[PDB]
Amino acid sequence: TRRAEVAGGGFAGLTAAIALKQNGWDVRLHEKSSELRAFGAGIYLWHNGLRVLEGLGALDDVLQGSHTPPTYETWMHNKSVSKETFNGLPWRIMTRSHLHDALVNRARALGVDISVNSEAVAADPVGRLTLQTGEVLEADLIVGADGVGSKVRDSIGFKQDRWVSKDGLIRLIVPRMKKELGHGEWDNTIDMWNFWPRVQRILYSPCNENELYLGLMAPAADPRGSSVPIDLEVWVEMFPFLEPCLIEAAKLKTARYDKYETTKLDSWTRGKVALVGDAAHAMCPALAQGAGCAMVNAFSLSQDLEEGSSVEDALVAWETRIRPITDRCQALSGDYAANRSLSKGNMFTPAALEAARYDPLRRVYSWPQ
Numbered sequence: 001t002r003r004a005e006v007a008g009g010g011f012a013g014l015t016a017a018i019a020l021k022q023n024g025w026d027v028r029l030h031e032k033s034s035e036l037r038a039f040g041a042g043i044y045l046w047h048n049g050l051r052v053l054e055g056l057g058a059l060d061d062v063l064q065g066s067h068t069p070p071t072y073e074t075w076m077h078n079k080s081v082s083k084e085t086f087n088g089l090p091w092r093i094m095t096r097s098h099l100h101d102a103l104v105n106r107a108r109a110l111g112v113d114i115s116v117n118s119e120a121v122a123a124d125p126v127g128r129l130t131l132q133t134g135e136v137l138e139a140d141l142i143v144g145a146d147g148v149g150s151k152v153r154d155s156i157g158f159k160q161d162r163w164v165s166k167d168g169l170i171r172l173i174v175p176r177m178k179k180e181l182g183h184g185e186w187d188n189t190i191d192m193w194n195f196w197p198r199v200q201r202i203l204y205s206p207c208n209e210n211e212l213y214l215g216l217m218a219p220a221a222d223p224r225g226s227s228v229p230i231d232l233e234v235w236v237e238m239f240p241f242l243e244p245c246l247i248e249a250a251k252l253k254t255a256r257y258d259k260y261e262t263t264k265l266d267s268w269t270r271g272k273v274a275l276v277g278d279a280a281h282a283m284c285p286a287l288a289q290g291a292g293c294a295m296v297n298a299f300s301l302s303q304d305l306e307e308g309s310s311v312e313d314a315l316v317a318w319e320t321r322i323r324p325i326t327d328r329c330q331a332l333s334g335d336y337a338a339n340r341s342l343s344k345g346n347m348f349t350p351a352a353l354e355a356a357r358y359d360p361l362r363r364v365y366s367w368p369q
């Protein structure tokens with residue numbers, strides 16, 4: 001029986017833990033925080049993430065209580081400029097807690113040993129993980145799924161470029177208020193852009209009958225539109241049709257203006273250590289693939305560990321096989337974010353949807369456009 005030690009209890013670490021435990025690994029997972037929780041309010045998944053959830057035995061619990069809008073709509077200056085449905089490609093909006101709780105419930109059902117208040121502070125490619133307590137754990141595989149600030153990565157030393165933006169956005173869950181919104185297509189995703197009379201955008205993202213995910217985006221140089229708790233007037237002025245939801249948003253004193261952040265590395269492996277998720281490839285969120293690529297890569301790691309090879313060799317084959325999809329998606333996401341490409345509408349082209357089209361279970365691209 002092969003042993004894996006996983007650092008990080010986010011989507012990458014929980015996916016790796018479940019996938020490895022289903023293949024007969026003895027897996028233990030270490031989360032630094034004192035509780036198992038996910039920040040960020042809401043999240044989109046696409047076919048590729050949903051197929052990972054199927055492969056993990058967690059798809060049902062995610063689809064119950066989450067939403068596929070009838071269309072992904074874009075507005076520019078309150079005019080609908082596109083409505084896209086991706087020729088049937090599956091996608092889904094949910095709260096972060098919904099996704100994260102479905103994964104924890106599945107890891108617990110399978111008997112993955114999960115520890116909280118358990119931080120990985122150093123790792124050794126020969127298969128050792130040191131916790132903040134000074135416990136040294138030996139394993140046949142070490143998974144660094146410890147986020148953009150991964151200590152598994154930085155204790156070993158990987159050549160990298162890391163960037164944190166000055167700009168960011170405010171992501172919140174509020175009640176749907178659907179009756180109070182009155183006439184409209186309030187089950188849709190609506191990406192509501194404006195450059196005039198100021199730069200303000202809301203991505204409107206229903207999660208289910210009760211819960212609405214809003215992303216309120218304004219530049220950090222705008223002291224009102226970047227304020228938390230939200231400056232209700234500046235948001236109601238440019239999105240008056242969402243006033244019932246904005247009034248609920250303005251009650252949230254836990255709101256944060258979170259910044260964008262990216263990582264790109266020379267490599268994702270060293271000996272028996274694999275870096276998965278934002279530890280390796282954090283990206284701009286324009287294509288809503290950061291967690292999709294983290295989950296595809298974590299599940300794909302598990303697949304390459306079933307080939308009969310040494311763990312070291314399986315890790316090299318895994319990066320070689322799967323990294324190009326993530327490098328392309330990171331680059332394209334970044335290009336769309338810098339160019340504000342989504343503001344044009346009709347930008348979920350075949351190329352943009354390549355990562356979402358990938359099926360990690362069959363290892364082919366599906367849902368042709």
Ligand SMILES: Cc1cc2nc3c(=O)[nH]c(=O)nc-3n(C[C@H](O)[C@H](O)[C@H](O)COP(=O)(O)OP(=O)(O)OC[C@H]3O[C@@H](n4cnc5c(N)ncnc54)[C@H](O)[C@@H]3O)c2cc1C
Nearest residue numbers: 008010011012032044119120146147277278285290291292
């Ligand atoms: C504004 C924004 C919008 C986004 N929207 C989407 C979207 O709609 N769809 C999508 O797919 N992606 C989205 N993403 C990307 C997604 O949030 C991340 O890519 C994904 O959460 C990364 O998962 P992860 O498990 O690698 O890291 P994380 O989710 O960061 O989890 C790492 C976990 O490790 C713990 N940890 C950290 N260090 C240690 C350590 N040393 N030891 C032990 N535990 C540790 C942390 O506490 C945390 O629980 C978005 C990101 C941003 C910034």
